[PDB]
């Protein structure tokens with residue numbers, strides 16, 4: 001059961017949680033999926049990650065208007081790469097309050113990304129400071145340490161068994177840690193395990209580029225990353 005709306009795919013994961021999927025052609029790879037989330041929280045909708053492009057991100061917003069018809073209160077992005085932050089201007093055009101790791105906002109301009117309007121900071125134990133993430137409701141935001149990038153953050157949805165590590169986590173069948181261009185190979189394994197320890201009851205781990213996996217995706221990722229220390 002996958003709903004198509006223009007060039008995007010939406011899959012219901014839980015009564016109030018959908019996965020959004022957008023595609024971009026990468027040389028040597030064909031069509032590449034990127035996933036984020038849509039969370040209904042009573043009278044509003046929360047978005048995790050843009051699509052690869054502004055136009056794709058506008059089609060997420062049109063799907064929400066058509067199928068949910070509740071306002072989008074806020075969007076949070078998980079790191080400053082095109083797949084997760086490439087649609088930032090589409091959210092600003094729609095009057096949506098946008099949030100990212102302070103470091104994501106620092107890195108976005110050089111990456112040709114638009115920074116979010118708001119900078120998240122994190123407590124010593126990795127949990128977001130609520131003063132920087134006001135009104136996040138069931139979105140629990142966690143900085144596990146550097147991994148895929150120095151800025152990568154993760155989210156869990158309270159009231160569900162769902163967590164999302166973005167590009168930090170690979171699926172359980174992966175043969176690679178993927179993009180090591182911006183990665184911290186020394187801390188990667190510990191950051192993967194920190195994410196699993198932050199959401200220990202999550203049984204559905206949403207993947208960045210493939211279908212949802214089990215906690216075996218977290219374990220598999222940490223074991224591959226163990227080999228680089």
Ligand SMILES: Cn1c(=O)cc(CP(=O)(O)O)c2cc(F)c(N3CCCC3)cc21
Nearest residue numbers: 148167168170176177178179180208209
């Ligand atoms: C080979 N490969 C993957 O398998 C998975 C991914 C996705 P992720 O695991 O990093 O999230 C990937 C990303 C890249 F940027 C990438 N390069 C970028 C320059 C050319 C190769 C390769 C990747």
Ligand SMILES: Cn1c(=O)cc(CP(=O)(O)O)c2cc(F)c(N3CCCC3)cc21
Nearest residue numbers: 026029032033081082083167178179209
């Ligand atoms: C080639 N390439 C990129 O340049 C950037 C990205 C974005 P990021 O993942 O670094 O944030 C990327 C993601 C993929 F999943 C990907 N594939 C997934 C399996 C095959 C190739 C390639 C990518």
Ligand SMILES: [Zn+2]
Nearest residue numbers: 079081148167
């Ligand atoms: Zn990335």
Ligand SMILES: [Zn+2]
Nearest residue numbers: 167178208209
């Ligand atoms: Zn990725």
